[PDB]
Motif scaffolding. Structure first.
Motif, PDB file in Angstrom:
ATOM      1  N   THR A   1      49.483  75.208 -21.179  1.00 52.51           N
ATOM      2  CA  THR A   1      50.586  74.253 -21.119  1.00 52.51           C
ATOM      3  C   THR A   1      50.674  73.398 -22.367  1.00 52.51           C
ATOM      4  O   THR A   1      51.761  72.974 -22.761  1.00 52.51           O
ATOM      5  CB  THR A   1      50.452  73.320 -19.913  1.00 52.51           C
ATOM      6  OG1 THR A   1      49.194  72.637 -19.952  1.00 52.51           O
ATOM      7  CG2 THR A   1      50.551  74.055 -18.661  1.00 52.51           C
TER       8      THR A   1
ATOM      9  N   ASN B   1      47.298  76.980 -15.007  1.00 55.02           N
ATOM     10  CA  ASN B   1      48.722  76.678 -15.147  1.00 55.02           C
ATOM     11  C   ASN B   1      49.205  77.090 -16.549  1.00 55.02           C
ATOM     12  O   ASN B   1      48.759  76.521 -17.548  1.00 55.02           O
ATOM     13  CB  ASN B   1      48.986  75.201 -14.860  1.00 55.02           C
ATOM     14  CG  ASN B   1      50.451  74.763 -15.050  1.00 55.02           C
ATOM     15  OD1 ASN B   1      51.372  75.596 -15.021  1.00 55.02           O
ATOM     16  ND2 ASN B   1      50.656  73.461 -15.241  1.00 55.02           N
TER      17      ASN B   1
ATOM     18  N   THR C   1      52.566  77.812 -18.982  1.00 56.53           N
ATOM     19  CA  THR C   1      53.997  77.619 -19.183  1.00 56.53           C
ATOM     20  C   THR C   1      54.460  78.115 -20.551  1.00 56.53           C
ATOM     21  O   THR C   1      55.649  78.388 -20.742  1.00 56.53           O
ATOM     22  CB  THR C   1      54.385  76.145 -18.997  1.00 56.53           C
ATOM     23  OG1 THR C   1      53.682  75.341 -19.948  1.00 56.53           O
ATOM     24  CG2 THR C   1      54.030  75.702 -17.597  1.00 56.53           C
TER      25      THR C   1
HETATM   26  C1  LIG Z   1      52.053  72.937 -15.482  1.00 56.98           C
HETATM   27  O1  LIG Z   1      52.027  71.855 -16.462  1.00 56.98           O
HETATM   28  C2  LIG Z   1      53.379  71.369 -16.812  1.00 56.98           C
HETATM   29  C3  LIG Z   1      53.236  70.294 -17.886  1.00 56.98           C
HETATM   30  O2  LIG Z   1      52.779  70.818 -19.124  1.00 56.98           O
HETATM   31  C4  LIG Z   1      54.105  70.821 -15.542  1.00 56.98           C
HETATM   32  O3  LIG Z   1      55.471  70.489 -15.900  1.00 56.98           O
HETATM   33  C5  LIG Z   1      55.863  69.059 -15.679  1.00 56.98           C
HETATM   34  O4  LIG Z   1      56.083  68.745 -14.280  1.00 56.98           O
HETATM   35  C6  LIG Z   1      56.437  67.332 -14.042  1.00 56.98           C
HETATM   36  C7  LIG Z   1      56.570  67.119 -12.538  1.00 56.98           C
HETATM   37  O5  LIG Z   1      57.616  67.900 -11.966  1.00 56.98           O
HETATM   38  C8  LIG Z   1      57.740  66.977 -14.822  1.00 56.98           C
HETATM   39  O6  LIG Z   1      58.070  65.600 -14.635  1.00 56.98           O
HETATM   40  C9  LIG Z   1      57.510  67.252 -16.338  1.00 56.98           C
HETATM   41  O7  LIG Z   1      58.705  66.951 -17.072  1.00 56.98           O
HETATM   42  C10 LIG Z   1      57.138  68.747 -16.540  1.00 56.98           C
HETATM   43  N1  LIG Z   1      56.830  68.996 -17.965  1.00 56.98           N
HETATM   44  C11 LIG Z   1      57.202  70.121 -18.586  1.00 56.98           C
HETATM   45  C12 LIG Z   1      56.854  70.333 -20.034  1.00 56.98           C
HETATM   46  O8  LIG Z   1      57.853  70.993 -17.990  1.00 56.98           O
HETATM   47  C13 LIG Z   1      54.153  71.952 -14.473  1.00 56.98           C
HETATM   48  O9  LIG Z   1      54.777  71.465 -13.274  1.00 56.98           O
HETATM   49  C14 LIG Z   1      52.709  72.427 -14.139  1.00 56.98           C
HETATM   50  N2  LIG Z   1      52.778  73.536 -13.170  1.00 56.98           N
HETATM   51  C15 LIG Z   1      51.878  73.682 -12.192  1.00 56.98           C
HETATM   52  C16 LIG Z   1      51.991  74.829 -11.239  1.00 56.98           C
HETATM   53  O10 LIG Z   1      50.945  72.872 -12.063  1.00 56.98           O
END
Ligand SMILES: *[C@@H]1O[C@H](CO)[C@@H](O[C@@H]2O[C@H](CO)[C@@H](O)[C@H](O)[C@H]2NC(C)=O)[C@H](O)[C@H]1NC(C)=O
Ligand SMILES: *[C@@H]1O[C@H](CO)[C@@H](O)[C@H](O)[C@H]1NC(C)=O
Ligand SMILES: *[C@@H]1O[C@H](CO)[C@@H](O)[C@H](O)[C@H]1NC(C)=O
Ligand SMILES: *[C@@H]1O[C@H](CO)[C@@H](O)[C@H](O)[C@H]1NC(C)=O
Ligand SMILES: *[C@@H]1O[C@H](CO)[C@@H](O)[C@H](O)[C@H]1NC(C)=O
Ligand SMILES: *[C@@H]1O[C@H](CO)[C@@H](O)[C@H](O)[C@H]1NC(C)=O
Ligand SMILES: *[C@@H]1O[C@H](CO)[C@@H](O)[C@H](O)[C@H]1NC(C)=O
Ligand SMILES: *[C@@H]1O[C@H](CO)[C@@H](O)[C@H](O)[C@H]1NC(C)=O
Ligand SMILES: *[C@@H]1O[C@H](CO)[C@@H](O)[C@H](O)[C@H]1NC(C)=O
Lengths: 363, 189, 49, 64
Positions: free
Chosen positions: B68, B146, B148
């Motif tokens: 991530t 995790n 992304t």
């Molecule tokens: C994996 O990590 C990412 C962050 O790097 C998470 O994405 C965030 O989720 C929060 C809550 O919904 C949001 O407010 C942020 O804006 C998101 N950030 C990004 C860069 O997308 C992601 O949800 C995590 N996934 C899991 C399965 O844990």
């Protein structure tokens, strides 16, 4: 025939009265050469458990999981299973098992279950409504409690929302209870979200510490790596047997096949998604699985007004499995097969008829 | 720069032997005739899963970083092919801006599929070329990670998988020899 | 195609059997389509459901 | 016991907030928590007991 037709007097003809089934003579069980024992001792006999707000999830794989060790120890106050009976854990084999380790109060043990609510169920350790596995817990008053209070165990009291199943939230961000931002600082309507448990040896049971291990069991369309304390037996071919291949069970006849499985394939399926081949988990040979023969059983009888002698047809099945005459319709027993072709009386099938003649039944 | 994915990105959805049969499956696959980004280094989105392919003579590409942040802080999955084996780690690695623990494991057109636990499928054939083949699983990594975004460590192509319905054709020997993308066009439907 | 009238009967009946058999793979709300698996997991009163 | 009482206090705080349909109720419960938290840290048994009894009455009003 009389019972089937609910009559004492049976008329001339052929009647289906039952079903023939070839029975299994033995049970073959096969597993890979895993002599590793699953590290339950490192979970249940651990010197330290994690705080409930930050539970420890350990994955168990590629080992022998003997659950009689835990189940019949009677050292546990709680042993509640969902989606599985605690006495069948040794027969089942799993893709994996997860051991979630933490400490809570005795009064909170009831929250470690699917469908439950409360500060633990909602803010610390949430189990899904469809949770499959076993929750095991025991009194740890003589392990974790300290005379001056053991405050090394934390739980979450405040959160912005409830947890998702198996979500682990270890944030220490100061909780905003009021209308103004806290900016990481405690104060008026701003609180540190985690509280300590005051565990002492003199506490009443509800306030004594309990060590909780949740064993989540995954049963998926994938190979098992965690499998019970079962022995392998000799492989038997060309006979009707019961079988168990790494938890894959059924009844049938197994033969050596000419099917060529790819290096990653463990079992096969036919056009109707029925298992028809397996890779033996020891010698890695491919065997076909064909069901043990069965078929309807029909009674061929002259009317009971003439004779109480009958012939029995076993449909489809070979005479080697059941005056014995093998015909296309099945194995006909009791009728004499003759050269002379007569007008059909009681039809059997595939050109064959039977009658009572100078007297006995002929085909 | 983009190229035509044609009919590539199909893989065996499970470990079940089938033969002489058309099987309907729902999984993450590269959609037929979709665009793949042609690279010839950057951090790319992972989305639902990734189709990756390369065409090399010098065998420069060595591995991938998945995560991530790809910058310490949290766990990243590092998969590197070095000399005679592949080394896989999930440490909180500090990576360089230009690169080239809870789990550890040690094991021309090269096609790979990376999807979420994390599974890796691949196919290696002699010679993005047009044609059809299916990729097969070579490792199962039971990692609670995790992911992304990812980075490729050193031409290659990157596509993305979608929850696409496919009808797969298994030949007499259980090999997938053909496939239909059920949402490509009315005839395929 | 001249004999389609006979082939149609064969196809309809074969299709009916394939349809029937494939229903065995359905869960119908159960934890598993496989009866042998249900009985290998649950005790009597839970298996009965 | 002061530690058992503190645990009772936090159980009551959770439930009191859980059933705190309005905002004024939440505000009072949070204030009660804060007072109990300070009393606990300073080993003031009487203040801690007082908050607990008040939380019990508050929750009874929310439930009944
Ligand atoms: C994996 O990590 C990412 C962050 O790097 C998470 O994405 C965030 O989720 C929060 C809550 O919904 C949001 O407010 C942020 O804006 C998101 N950030 C990004 C860069 O997308 C992601 O949800 C995590 N996934 C899991 C399965 O844990
Ligand atoms: C834990 O230790 C006790 C010691 O009496 C032993 O009987 C028990 O089997 C051990 N449990 C595990 C999982 O090893
Ligand atoms: C198990 O051991 C036998 C020797 O007794 C060997 O032939 C077999 O290949 C081994 N199988 C596995 C999966 O290790
Ligand atoms: C049946 O039995 C009766 C005697 O009760 C006899 O009169 C009759 O002829 C018999 N019929 C046949 C077909 O045997
Ligand atoms: C019965 O088994 C024998 C082999 O022992 C075989 O030759 C024969 O064709 C079989 N008959 C039927 C009806 O299956
Ligand atoms: C038919 O007759 C021949 C002799 O000519 C004999 O060998 C054969 O077994 C007979 N068939 C039956 C069913 O009795
Ligand atoms: C691929 O991208 C080009 C633009 O470079 C566009 O014209 C084409 O339609 C795209 N094809 C697909 C399948 O998205
Ligand atoms: C590859 O790198 C690993 C360290 O990540 C090292 O342990 C291994 O020996 C190296 N292998 C070769 C063949 O150089
Ligand atoms: C299956 O493998 C054999 C080699 O053992 C090969 O001759 C045959 O053509 C293959 N069948 C198919 C459909 O590829």
């Amino acid at each position: 025939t009389k019972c089937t037709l609910k009559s004492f007097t049976v008329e001339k003809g052929i009647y289906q009265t039952s079903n023939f089934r070839v029975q299994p003579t033995e049970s073959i069980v096969r597993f890979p050469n895993i002599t590793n024992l699953c590290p339950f001792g490192e979970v249940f006999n651990a010197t330290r458990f994690a705080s409930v707000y930050a539970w420890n999830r350990k994955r168990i794989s590629n080992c022998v999981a003997d659950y009689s060790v835990l189940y019949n120890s009677a050292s546990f106050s709680t042993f509640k299973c969902y989606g599985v009976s605690p006495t069948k854990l040794n027969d089942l084999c799993f893709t994996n098992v997860y051991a979630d380790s933490f400490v809570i109060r005795g009064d909170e043990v009831r929250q470690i279950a699917p469908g439950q609510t409360g500060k633990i169920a909602d803010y610390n350790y949430k189990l899904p409504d469809d949770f499959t596995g076993c929750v095991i817990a025991w009194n740890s008053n003589n392990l974790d409690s300290k005379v001056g209070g053991n405050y090394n165990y934390l739980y979450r009291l405040f959160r912005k929302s409830n947890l998702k199943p198996f979500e682990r939230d270890i944030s220490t961000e100061i909780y905003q209870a009021g209308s103004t931002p806290c900016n990481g600082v405690e104060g008026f309507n701003c609180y540190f979200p985690l509280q300590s448990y005051g565990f002492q040896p003199t506490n009443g049971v509800g306030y004594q510490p309990y060590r909780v291990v949740v064993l989540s069991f995954e049963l998926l369309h994938a190979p098992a790596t965690v499998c019970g304390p079962k022995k392998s037996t000799n492989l038997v071919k060309n006979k009707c047997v019961n079988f168990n291949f790494n938890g894959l069970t059924g009844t049938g006849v197994l033969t050596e096949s000419n099917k060529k499985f790819l290096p990653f394939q463990q079992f096969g399926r036919d056009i109707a998604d029925t298992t028809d081949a397996v890779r033996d988990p020891q010698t890695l040979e491919i065997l076909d699985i064909t069901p043990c023969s069965f078929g309807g059983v029909s009674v061929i009888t002259p009317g009971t007004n003439t004779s109480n002698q009958v012939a029995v047809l076993y449909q489809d099945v070979n005479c080697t499995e059941v005056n014995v005459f093998q015909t296309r319709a099945g194995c006909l027993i009791g009728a004499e097969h003759v050269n002379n072709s007569y007008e059909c009386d009681i039809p059997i099938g595939a050109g064959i008829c039977a009658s009572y003649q100078t007297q006995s039944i002929i085909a | 720069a983009y190229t035509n994915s044609f009919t590539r990105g199909v893989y065996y959805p499970d470990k079940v032997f089938r033969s002489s049969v058309l099987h309907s499956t729902q999984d993450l696959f590269l959609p037929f005739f979709s665009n793949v980004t042609w690279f010839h280094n950057p951090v790319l989105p992972f989305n639902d899963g990734v189709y990756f392919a390369s065409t090399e003579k010098s065998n420069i590409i060595r591995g991938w970083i998945f995560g991530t942040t790809l910058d310490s802080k949290t766990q990243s999955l590092l998969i590197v092919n070095n000399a005679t084996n592949v080394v896989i780690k999930v440490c909180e690695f500090q990576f360089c801006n230009d690169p080239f623990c809870t789990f550890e494991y040690v094991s021309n057109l090269r096609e790979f599929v990376f999807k979420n636990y994390f599974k890796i499928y691949s196919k290696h054939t002699p010679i993005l070329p047009q044609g059809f083949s299916a990729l097969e699983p070579l490792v199962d990594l039971p990692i609670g990670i995790n992911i992304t975004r990812f980075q490729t460590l050193l031409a290659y192509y990157v596509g993305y998988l979608q929850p696409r319905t496919f009808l797969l054709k298994y030949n007499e020997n259980g090999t997938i020899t053909d496939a239909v993308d059920c949402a490509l066009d009315p005839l395929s439907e | 195609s001249a004999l389609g009238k006979l082939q149609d009967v064969v196809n309809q009946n074969a299709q009916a059997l394939n349809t029937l058999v494939k229903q065995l793979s359905s869960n119908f709300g159960a934890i598993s389509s496989v009866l042998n698996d249900i009985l290998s997991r649950l005790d009597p009163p839970e298996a009965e459901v | 016991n002061d530690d058992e009482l503190h645990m009772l206090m936090t159980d009551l705080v959770y439930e009191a907030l859980h059933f705190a349909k309005d905002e004024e109720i939440k505000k009072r419960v949070f204030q009660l928590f804060e007072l109990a938290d300070k009393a606990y840290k300073n080993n003031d048994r009487q203040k801690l007991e007082k908050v607990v009894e008040e939380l019990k009455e508050l929750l009874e009003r929310l439930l009944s």
